[PDB]
Amino acid sequence: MRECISIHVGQAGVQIGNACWELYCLEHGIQPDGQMPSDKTIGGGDDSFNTFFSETGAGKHVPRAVFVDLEPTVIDEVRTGTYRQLFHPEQLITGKEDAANNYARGHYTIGKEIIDLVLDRIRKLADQCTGLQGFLVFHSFGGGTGSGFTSLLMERLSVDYGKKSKLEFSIYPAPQVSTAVVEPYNSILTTHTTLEHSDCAFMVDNEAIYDICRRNLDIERPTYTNLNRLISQIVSSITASLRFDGALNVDLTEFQTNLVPYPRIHFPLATYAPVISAEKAYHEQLSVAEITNACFEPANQMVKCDPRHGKYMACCLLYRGDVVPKDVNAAIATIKTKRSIQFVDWCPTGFKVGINYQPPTVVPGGDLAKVQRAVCMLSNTTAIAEAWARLDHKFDLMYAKRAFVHWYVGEGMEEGEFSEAREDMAALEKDYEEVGVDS
C-alpha cells in the first residue's frame, strides 16, 4: 500500500476538496466523526482505502489532505462543517489577505511568506507514509491563489519530492459563473509555470459543468454547491482505482503510463454518464451500451470540444456498478462503426477498461439520482487544444493593450513573464496540431 496526499488550494480547490472527502466518506462507510465500523484493524491496516485515510489509535480515519487558502472564510467552513471532526488544525492553513485574483500576488508577494509553512504541514503528512506515491492538487486556473500559489507549490514539490508523481484537477474559467476578468492571464501564467511539474492534469471547464447541471439536473441557475457535487462524482470516478481493490490505475504513475505518451500533452478529456435528476419521479436505467455511447457526446464532456476533429492517443473506460466485460466489448464494437474515433498512427486503437462493482454513491438530499451503472471515460485527444486556443485568444486581446498588466508588475512580476508564458502556450498549441492534424 502506497499513500496519496491531497492538496486543495484556494476557494475552488478547498470547496471541491470538501465535496470529494464527503463523498469518499460515504463510499467507504466512514462517519463524520471519523469512525469506520467495517475496518476491523483498529488504529492501522494497509487496505486500499488507507491510501487516502490514516488511522489513529482511537479508530478515527483521517484524510491525508492539506487545505490551503490565503484568506480564511472558505476554510473556516471546513473547520465548522459536518466533517469538522475528520480533520485536525494542522491540516487547515489560512492566511489573512487573499491574492485578489492576481497571479503575481499569490505566487510572489504572499506565496513567498507562506510557502515554507505549507511545506512543513505537508512534510508532517509525508512523515506518516511508508511509501508515498505523490500528490493530487486541486485548484482553479482563474483565482490568484489557485493559479499563483499552486504553481509555486508545484515547483517546490518537485524539489522536495523529486521522484513523486503529481496530478492536477484544475477548474478552467467560465464567464457564466465568474465575476473576474483577468482569469485568462492567471490561467496562462500558471499553466506555463506548472507544465513541467505536473504529470497528468484533469481540466474541468465550469461552462461544461454548469450546462450539464442546467440541462440534465434541471437546475435553472446552478450554484457552486451544485457544480461541486457533480465535479466530486467525476473526481471520485478517477480516484476510485487508488482507493479500492483493482488492477487498473492502481498508482499515480499508471495514469501517466496509460494516458500520457507525450509529456507536455498531459491533459486528458473526461466524459461522464449518466447524470440524472433526483427530482425525476422514475428514470429508466441506461444500459452499458447507452452510457458508453454517451461518452462520445460533447454534451457530457468536462470540457466542451469536438473529438471528431482530433486524434486519440489513449482511452480509459472506468465503470462503476452492474457492468460485465461482455457488455462493454459489445458496446465498444457498435460504437466503432458509428463514431469518428481516429487514433494517432503511433498508438494502438484500443481501450483500457476498469470495472468497480459498487455503483456510484450519491450525497443524500443531493441533485443526482442513484443509478445502477455509470462510466467515466478518460481520453487524451488533441481536441482539448480548442480550450487552449480559446484561453490564448482572450489573453491576446487584453495583452495587446496591456490591460490590467500594471496590477501584476506592481507585485514584482516582470512584463517579460507574460510573453514568455504566452510563447510556451503557443508552442503547446503547435504540439497539439502536429500530433492531431493532417495537412
Binding site: 479500492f244 466489448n329 477498461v353 514584482g412
Partner: protein, 54 residues
C-alpha cells in the same frame, strides 16, 4: 477485437481491448526569482515614497 490482461477480484475486474495495432529549477533558483520580485516591489515602493517626500 482482442481482450487481454483480464484481472478479476471481488471488487471488480479490468482488461484491455485492442481494435487495431499501431503503424527542474533548484531550491536556490526558486529563491532568487522570489527575492528578485520582492526587490522590484521594494524599488517601486521606494520610488513612491521618494515622490511623496518631494
Amino acid at each position: 477485437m482482442e481482450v487481454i490482461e483480464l484481472n478479476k477480484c471481488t471488487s471488480g475486474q479490468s482488461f484491455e481491448v485492442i481494435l487495431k495495432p499501431p503503424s527542474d529549477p533548484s531550491l536556490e533558483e526558486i529563491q532568487k526569482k522570489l527575492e528578485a520580485a520582492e526587490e522590484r516591489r521594494k524599488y517601486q515602493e521606494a520610488e513612491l515614497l521618494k515622490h511623496l517626500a518631494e
